[PDB]
């Protein structure tokens, strides 16, 4: 047999894999968290987008901190042997390293740990992708004119830079998700995932700017952040 190259994840398993979409819109009153208008638009876009990539999409809405954890645990214990990859999309309130259940927060690290190389072996060596639309703090960008590591093969696609707010439009959905779906829709059959994510960075960075009656929140910008510990190139085809 002719010479072979090994630069890309094997994405030709019988299944592309799960796409779990956690859509938190409505929060228990006691948390003091606002209702996240527009997030349903994000959830629908993602569902359709990842449907077309041939992912087995599971939408979950309005989950408690307990339900998020139990869900992630249960999913990490499924047999992923026939699956190429895993995708988990989190839409909620957040702070740095944290996303909100409807009744309180969960550590991102606690969610991702379920899928570590040593804790879910049917996903070992396969790409584990986490896409997070949530704040990472309260800063505003004013813009300017024989063994593998257990943390290997994780990619975290953050909506925003570390420490910063992330922006969501109540009508159109969040800047990040809408841009992400557009680029997946447009480039998933021709670009490796990092270059797709890089077009998402540019789209968000250049095409969006906030409008507010409050000068503190007006004319602000956003740059998403790619957190990659992938060891191969990922192509959805």
């Amino acid at each position: 047999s002719g010479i072979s190259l090994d630069n890309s994840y094997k994405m030709d398993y019988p299944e592309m894999g799960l796409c779990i979409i956690i859509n938190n819109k409505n929060f228990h009153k006691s948390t003091g968290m606002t209702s996240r208008s527009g997030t349903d638009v994000d959830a629908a876009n993602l569902r359709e987008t990842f449907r077309n990539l041939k992912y087995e999409v599971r939408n979950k809405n309005d989950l408690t901190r307990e339900e998020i954890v139990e869900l992630m645990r249960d999913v990490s214990k499924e047999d992923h042997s026939k699956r190429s990859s895993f995708v988990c999309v989190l839409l909620s309130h957040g702070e740095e390293g944290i996303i909100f259940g409807t009744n309180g927060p969960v550590d991102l690290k606690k969610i991702t740990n379920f899928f570590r190389g040593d804790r879910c072996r049917s996903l070992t060596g396969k790409p584990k992708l986490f896409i997070i639309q949530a704040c990472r703090g309260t800063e505003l960008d004013c813009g300017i004119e024989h063994k593998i590591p257990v943390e290997a093969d994780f990619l975290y696609a953050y909506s925003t830079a570390p420490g910063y707010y992330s922006w969501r439009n109540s009508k159109d959905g969040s800047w990040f998700i809408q841009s992400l779906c557009a680029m997946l829709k447009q480039y998933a059959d021709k670009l490796e995932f990092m270059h797709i994510l890089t077009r998402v960075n540019r789209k968000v960075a250049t095409e969006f700017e906030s409008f507010s009656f409050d000068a503190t929140f007006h004319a602000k910008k956003q740059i998403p952040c790619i957190h990659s510990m992938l060891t191969k190139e990922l192509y959805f085809y």
């Binding site: 996240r36 639309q133 909506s159 922006w167 109540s170 409008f211 507010s212 929140f217």
Partner: peptide
Amino acid sequence: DEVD
């Protein structure tokens, strides 16, 4: 426009 709102923040998360």
